[PDB]
Amino acid sequence: EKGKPLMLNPRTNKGMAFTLQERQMLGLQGLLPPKIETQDIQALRFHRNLKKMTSPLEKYIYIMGIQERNEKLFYRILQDDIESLMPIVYTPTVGLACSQYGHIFRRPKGLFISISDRGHVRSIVDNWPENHVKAVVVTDGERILGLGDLGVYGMGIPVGKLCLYTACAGIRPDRCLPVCIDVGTDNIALLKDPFYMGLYQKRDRTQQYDDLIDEFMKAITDRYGRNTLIQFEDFGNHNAFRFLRKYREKYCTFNDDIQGTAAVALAGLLAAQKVISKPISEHKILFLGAGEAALGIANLIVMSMVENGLSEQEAQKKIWMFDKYGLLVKGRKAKIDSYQEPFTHSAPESIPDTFEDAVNILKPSTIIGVAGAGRLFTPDVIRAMASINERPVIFALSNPTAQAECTAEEAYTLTEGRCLFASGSPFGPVKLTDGRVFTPGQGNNVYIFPGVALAVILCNTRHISDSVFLEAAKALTSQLTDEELAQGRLYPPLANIQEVSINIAIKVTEYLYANKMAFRYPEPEDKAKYVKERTWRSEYDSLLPDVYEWP
Amino acid sequence: EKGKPLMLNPRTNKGMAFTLQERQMLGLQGLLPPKIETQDIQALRFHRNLKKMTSPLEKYIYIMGIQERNEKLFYRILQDDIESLMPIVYTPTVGLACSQYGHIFRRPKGLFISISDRGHVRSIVDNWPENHVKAVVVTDGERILGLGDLGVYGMGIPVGKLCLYTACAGIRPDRCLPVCIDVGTDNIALLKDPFYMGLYQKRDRTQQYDDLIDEFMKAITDRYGRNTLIQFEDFGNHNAFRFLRKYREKYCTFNDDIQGTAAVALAGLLAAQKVISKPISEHKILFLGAGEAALGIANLIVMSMVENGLSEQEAQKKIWMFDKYGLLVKGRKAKIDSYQEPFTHSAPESIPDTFEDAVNILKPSTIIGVAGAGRLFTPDVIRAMASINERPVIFALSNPTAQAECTAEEAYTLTEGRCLFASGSPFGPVKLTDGRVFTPGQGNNVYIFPGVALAVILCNTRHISDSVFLEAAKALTSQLTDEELAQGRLYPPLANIQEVSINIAIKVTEYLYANKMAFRYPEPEDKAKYVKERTWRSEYDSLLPDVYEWP
Amino acid sequence: EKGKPLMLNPRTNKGMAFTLQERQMLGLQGLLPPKIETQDIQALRFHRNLKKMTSPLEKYIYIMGIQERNEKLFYRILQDDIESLMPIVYTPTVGLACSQYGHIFRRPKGLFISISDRGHVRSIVDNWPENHVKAVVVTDGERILGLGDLGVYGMGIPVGKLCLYTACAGIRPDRCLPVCIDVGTDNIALLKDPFYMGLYQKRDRTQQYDDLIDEFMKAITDRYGRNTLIQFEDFGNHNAFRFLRKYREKYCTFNDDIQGTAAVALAGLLAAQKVISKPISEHKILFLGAGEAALGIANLIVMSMVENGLSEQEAQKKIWMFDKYGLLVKGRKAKIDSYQEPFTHSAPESIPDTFEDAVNILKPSTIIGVAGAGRLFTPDVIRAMASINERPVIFALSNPTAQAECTAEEAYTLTEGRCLFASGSPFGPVKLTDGRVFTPGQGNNVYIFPGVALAVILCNTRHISDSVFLEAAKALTSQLTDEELAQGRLYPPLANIQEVSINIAIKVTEYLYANKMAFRYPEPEDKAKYVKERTWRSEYDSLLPDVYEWP
Ligand SMILES: NC(=O)c1ccc[n+]([C@@H]2O[C@H](COP(=O)([O-])OP(=O)(O)OC[C@H]3O[C@@H](n4cnc5c(N)ncnc54)[C@H](O)[C@@H]3O)[C@@H](O)[C@H]2O)c1
Ligand SMILES: NC(=O)c1ccc[n+]([C@@H]2O[C@H](COP(=O)([O-])OP(=O)(O)OC[C@H]3O[C@@H](n4cnc5c(N)ncnc54)[C@H](O)[C@@H]3O)[C@@H](O)[C@H]2O)c1
Ligand SMILES: NC(=O)c1ccc[n+]([C@@H]2O[C@H](COP(=O)([O-])OP(=O)(O)OC[C@H]3O[C@@H](n4cnc5c(N)ncnc54)[C@H](O)[C@@H]3O)[C@@H](O)[C@H]2O)c1
Ligand SMILES: NC(=O)c1ccc[n+]([C@@H]2O[C@H](COP(=O)([O-])OP(=O)(O)OC[C@H]3O[C@@H](n4cnc5c(N)ncnc54)[C@H](O)[C@@H]3O)[C@@H](O)[C@H]2O)c1
Numbered sequence A, B, C: 001e002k003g004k005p006l007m008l009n010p011r012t013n014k015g016m017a018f019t020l021q022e023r024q025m026l027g028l029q030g031l032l033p034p035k036i037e038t039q040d041i042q043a044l045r046f047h048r049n050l051k052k053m054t055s056p057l058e059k060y061i062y063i064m065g066i067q068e069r070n071e072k073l074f075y076r077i078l079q080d081d082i083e084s085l086m087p088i089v090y091t092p093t094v095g096l097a098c099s100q101y102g103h104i105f106r107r108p109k110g111l112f113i114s115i116s117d118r119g120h121v122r123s124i125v126d127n128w129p130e131n132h133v134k135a136v137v138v139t140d141g142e143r144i145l146g147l148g149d150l151g152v153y154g155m156g157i158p159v160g161k162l163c164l165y166t167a168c169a170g171i172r173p174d175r176c177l178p179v180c181i182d183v184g185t186d187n188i189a190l191l192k193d194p195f196y197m198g199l200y201q202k203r204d205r206t207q208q209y210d211d212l213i214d215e216f217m218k219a220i221t222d223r224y225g226r227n228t229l230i231q232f233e234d235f236g237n238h239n240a241f242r243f244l245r246k247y248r249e250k251y252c253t254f255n256d257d258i259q260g261t262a263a264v265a266l267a268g269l270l271a272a273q274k275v276i277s278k279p280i281s282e283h284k285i286l287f288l289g290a291g292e293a294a295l296g297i298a299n300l301i302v303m304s305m306v307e308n309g310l311s312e313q314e315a316q317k318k319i320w321m322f323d324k325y326g327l328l329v330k331g332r333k334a335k336i337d338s339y340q341e342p343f344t345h346s347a348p349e350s351i352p353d354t355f356e357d358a359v360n361i362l363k364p365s366t367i368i369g370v371a372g373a374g375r376l377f378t379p380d381v382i383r384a385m386a387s388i389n390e391r392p393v394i395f396a397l398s399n400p401t402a403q404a405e406c407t408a409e410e411a412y413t414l415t416e417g418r419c420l421f422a423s424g425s426p427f428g429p430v431k432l433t434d435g436r437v438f439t440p441g442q443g444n445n446v447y448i449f450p451g452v453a454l455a456v457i458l459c460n461t462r463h464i465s466d467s468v469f470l471e472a473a474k475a476l477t478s479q480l481t482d483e484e485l486a487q488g489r490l491y492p493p494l495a496n497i498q499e500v501s502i503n504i505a506i507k508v509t510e511y512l513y514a515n516k517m518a519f520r521y522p523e524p525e526d527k528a529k530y531v532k533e534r535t536w537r538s539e540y541d542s543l544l545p546d547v548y549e550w551p
């Protein structure tokens, strides 16, 4: 309306950016200090206030406070210094906040559906004020980064993720809905806490759990549409793979942990090859770890191979996996699951009892660290790759840094700068002795999920096939310039995650349309112009009314 | 209404306290974490959080964020630890916040009137969303405590002041209005700060300034009534006195800086007399300082004296003042003003050039430190007094602690535990070589204004005479129990400022009616029941609609 | 929200129908009489009330007052007695209301755009409180039926028109937008009336007029979309045709006055052919009149013919027209326009000076009365036709009844019950000397536009081709059951216009998809289920919030 409510609403509050005319006309005069500020000035104010801040957590609390008060300024701010603000609002720090959730808590943020609510999920869904919701991010808080099961504190994740859907892709904030399904928590620490904000019960694993997810899926589509994008996040391996399969062809869904991961990784391996043009038949990849990330990446790698001329079987034979019980080999005592068998091959004559051994026995051309257990890519493992291959492809994806398999410096120096390196955690440029400076790239999931979400939404796509991620991967790598690829950059600078994201969305829409997966039909001729035109801008909208005379 | 709006309104918002029933029936189910908490658990969480807090400003930012999200909880917390929180929300920490204003600024909190809006102050005033305003606190921010002129940053004062009107007296927050008039600022640190939130101009001191205060005075009573309590604060000596003189008989107004000061001070003295019972005529009071506070406490002392059998001229002659220029003598080169004149006596035979000399030449039985210039109550002046009087009354009121004229330990030790001591800033017990524990009291204004504002509001009083303050002083001193005086306390424990404030309310109302100053006329027989029956409680209200069958 | 606002909103207001539960839980308990009624009792009360009503205008004022207080009830009532109410709400009574407008005026009901607001039409358009508008009906009020130019009083037309879009087709009322453009009025009775509610100026006919229609056309699609259904009505021949030509391929628009007329008419003829099966080439149609309606039905006949094996030139030659100036002959002094030209044939040897002569000289097998000038189908012309044709097709379409060319009794009696008859205005059975009951049908547009608007809306069609109307005509005629034709009905009973309208919807959608005219592409397999699944129901919705325990 007019007056105060205009200020108590973040979707409208312009704060001191309300002009004099607006303050006067809207009944705000006197309610704000005597100075009128522009959006530029407000961003400049926050930047300074955040600049002189210590912890990433306090930076988080402060910036998220800006979102609950002024959504336009908040995105302007976060878009003005996205490279550094992204890890605060999301990526690494959000996980710190999910730990303090309840202690740092100040104001709710999304939609909470508890197992106690079973049978009434649509009523809870109908309580969501937004009518035109296009992008939903769900989590049950069961697996938050390396923090484990945080219960309802996991809500901090979808919130931060959606923050990026908007900041990078330009997806409308009002059409985004963060959701957290509370079925209980297995984290005893939380259960004991009297300030815990969730169901005081152990994670319900009964059928009720499955039915509740079904209900929630149905309820969301019933009100918002069968094509409403629903992305699972931090669900817990078993549920994440099975729900992905169970719904992928029934709803517009996908799990970023499995597929976004798979695509960012593939994108790296693709930029590598653009360097060492060697027969795809000349590749053998070794995985340090055989879990969620490893499986998603293998599967998408295999798909890249097949589409190039190799059988499914052939593609999978060039992929080996080494988890905490050693090389995933046919018959081994340690058990192997469905998703793993395709990569569980016949034991070599020499069964390694060390990754370094495997690296020597199997002789892979590429190594991928997804074990999340420290520097397991020892100098012995490293130099044992630089010796085996002219240009070793080394991927240490385990986060946070302390968990990585190795640093960039380790990789580069130990390989005299002949390795193609990339990691999940950031590392600065490694300037060796000869003067060479190698700028390593970080394979962050944000390169993929935002542009893929927008493309699917703008094309009214109702089902997301894995082929869209291969397409996505390809689209990311195609962004890398010559010079970028010449300095060890297997990823475009995170500083332009925006145009990279649009470019990715544009390419993906072109793909959806050409493969009849799109349904917004008076089909655009210029898919670029199309996408570019539908991106939400953080610019403030003028509120004045059109007043004119009359002849 | 119901739904989100209910949560976005601090007056109604009860956070995790809304019951399941309320959430369901109100359209909130799903917008809040699946946990039901009590105001007790809530208070408990924020308390524990605040305990583990380092800096006070942080503490202030934290707690002021609760007040902007859940008013009830805020006052609940504030009242749960009144003594420790009052100084954060107001008393001393608030002044630190005013210097920060613009840096810490999260959301606006009061009504801003600028000399730019002259002629249109009513419009601004009509923008205030509350219709039944009973208590206004104004400031032009010209003299915030020791910080000086902080322009519009002075708003933090009326805001914190009012928090206490509510916290101690039970004055309904929705009937409180924090006001700040911006007529320019003389502070060059401000005029040059690009993120300053006020008018970039030197303080206007022309007729427009006076005209604007009148306009504001008329605009406020026009909308809310002529009996609307308007309290001035941190205005700057010349204006504070003259405006006090100019409207005290035209409106319902008072100046806590002048009048509330005179009452807590005077109430300390009255407390002392419970020990030193000698005739009032035998008193001689020497003031370290001759400013606003010296002239305030002095004039009120005179009245207590005059009302005790002394002519007004004699009363005046029992008081002496020593500013920076030395003893306020008749004829001194150092200029003397109209308000000091009555205390500028003829020069004694021995004119001191030092306060120690003065203490000697006049041998006052009472000394009041109000110069705000550090320890001017030298260990010698102290002892001088202990030798001139059996139980000397030493009042070191200058704040903050660093400006205090001396300390608890100082005074008590240098007097052997004979002196009766009081100070502006706090000091903990002073245990002596003989094991005698001496707990001094603090002369904080918060003792007077809360209970006095509520009495005036509830009686529909239209004017406040100094006699009302004399009565508050006597009402406060009557709160002192034998024991606390047996401990050195010249005031009741600040720990229970609530009841002390209510009891002062009941006292002053009784006096107002009895003196035909009250206008709420169906006059109560039990003034106690009357006051207590009208205090605002912090208890959450039930928001559940009445559902029942129809027989 | 809840409370009074819920009752002041016709969309939500359910009057005495709100349940006790809803009243209690919604804050209405006490604001409504202590009685709970059903929509059935409600409908029943207003029905009985309306039965005991004398004049139709009263009936209109009454019922239009229900629509402004309770939308659901309104459509419930309207649909409970569709045949008798349609003529009150629209068809004929509505025109009477337009003359009264300003006298009967209670509350505004649509969107008013004035030539005064040129350049600012978007602003006005943005003021419309509905965001998802699917159907707009525009009129400049230049030609309201027989009443002529009624300026802004023409608003009553789009309003009543739309009531039927909803009543018969099930098009959601909140997605309907009645529009009236005021560019001045030529009516002197209006220009002089001091209580006139429009612009006191003669109709603008300069470029500004054309410019304003464009502006309106662009402003409407700008906000709601390019596929937004915009229907023109009562515009005035020249404009209605030219604007129809100008935008039919630019926007999603049609003119019911031209196109809907041509379809009900033509659908009557098609019905007749179910009796007179002779080859289409053997048909000869003579028109009494050569205006908008004659040119509409003619052109659509041509298309049905052309699509049946006739060249377009021949089709045209099977039609003849007789305006006020006599037979439309080649060379006649009486001017002939571009639209009549194709039906202005070379003069026969015997040029009639009378329609009876014409009927003789051309011996048409079909005659259509569209001159709006009373009984021009003289008892002689009638018999002439009955002697020229075994079963002559006589269509007296001029309205109201007084302008009809002849009557049911007339035609049937003067033909011995051989003629196939249809009329614009209603006529009850015509029982004959032999006891043969002849129930004629009425060619009301309400047969076509409702079902056609819904088909176009649901298919996201962006343009409407005459072929769509040809299809509506064939879709309607297919509704006719043997029996009703056995009774003389050349159209289905207006009593069941609902299903007849839905069935026409399902038919036209099937045609739209099949001809690549639809754009809602996840194309339904069961178009019937698709249409029926999207009709708006008049049933009251439950407003009770979901309350339940937590196990
Ligand atoms: N974009 C990215 O950078 C990105 C994306 C997804 C996951 N990751 C990282 O991948 C790591 C693993 O994630 P996940 O979801 O696959 O986990 P997971 O728990 O599903 O699997 C971890 C695997 O590592 C193996 N492992 C653990 N300790 C080992 C050890 N000491 N020696 C050998 N193998 C060991 C386990 O057997 C297991 O198979 C995490 O650190 C995560 O940060 C990075
Ligand atoms: N052929 C055309 O180009 C055409 C046709 C009809 C209407 N329109 C215009 O489009 C508007 C209405 O169409 P629409 O809303 O379906 O848009 P759209 O068709 O351009 O977008 C397609 C889908 O993407 C979604 N979307 C767009 N931007 C989004 C964002 N930034 N964040 C999240 N989701 C987003 C929409 O909800 C929609 O479901 C109207 O204003 C109209 O002027 C264009
Ligand atoms: N309730 C309380 O405890 C309370 C209330 C009000 C004021 N105060 C304190 O009183 C002090 C002064 O307040 P004010 O508003 O009257 O100030 P003011 O500026 O109006 O007056 C200060 C006076 O002290 C004199 N002075 C300054 N330095 C001196 C020196 N070195 N030696 C002797 N005299 C000196 C000045 O001449 C001046 O007359 C402040 O520090 C304030 O904290 C305490
Ligand atoms: N004789 C009686 O005891 C009597 C007579 C009439 C009405 N009432 C009751 O009083 C209520 C309304 O009357 P009222 O509001 O004028 O009360 P009031 O007349 O008792 O209060 C006197 C004044 O003090 C103000 N006030 C009361 N509590 C306040 C608070 N906590 N904070 C700030 N200002 C406060 C009021 O606004 C009023 O101007 C009604 O609900 C009615 O039930 C009592």
Ligand SMILES: NC(=O)c1ccc[n+]([C@@H]2O[C@H](COP(=O)([O-])OP(=O)(O)OC[C@H]3O[C@@H](n4cnc5c(N)ncnc54)[C@H](O)[C@@H]3O)[C@@H](O)[C@H]2O)c1
Pocket (backbone or CB within 6 Å): C237, C257, C261, C264, C288, C289, C290, C291, C292, C293, C294, C322, C323, C324, C325, C369, C370, C371, C372, C373, C376, C397, C398, C399, C400, C403, C423, C424, C425, C443, C444, C445
């Ligand atoms: N669905 C229906 O039943 C329906 C639909 C549309 C129009 N109509 C009726 O058709 C009539 C005309 O509508 P229109 O919009 O085409 O009108 P119009 O003014 O555009 O055309 C009327 C034509 O009739 C001719 N005419 C007038 N008097 C004549 C006379 N005395 N003898 C011979 N010809 C004469 C005129 O020359 C003119 O060409 C109206 O009365 C209207 O009620 C019925």
Ligand SMILES: NC(=O)c1ccc[n+]([C@@H]2O[C@H](COP(=O)([O-])OP(=O)(O)OC[C@H]3O[C@@H](n4cnc5c(N)ncnc54)[C@H](O)[C@@H]3O)[C@@H](O)[C@H]2O)c1
Pocket (backbone or CB within 6 Å): A221, A222, A223, A224, A225, A226, A227, C134, C170, C171, C172, C173, C175, C457, C458, C459, C460, C520, C522, C534, C535, C536
């Ligand atoms: N494949 C499917 O069957 C499918 C796919 C996605 C969403 N949905 C459902 O559709 C709903 C929202 O989609 P939609 O509104 O675009 O529907 P829709 O796509 O089925 O309807 C097509 C068009 O017709 C309009 N429309 C429908 N009924 C109307 C009516 N009665 N009156 C006037 N206009 C009407 C709509 O506004 C839309 O522009 C959601 O609640 C969702 O559950 C169904």
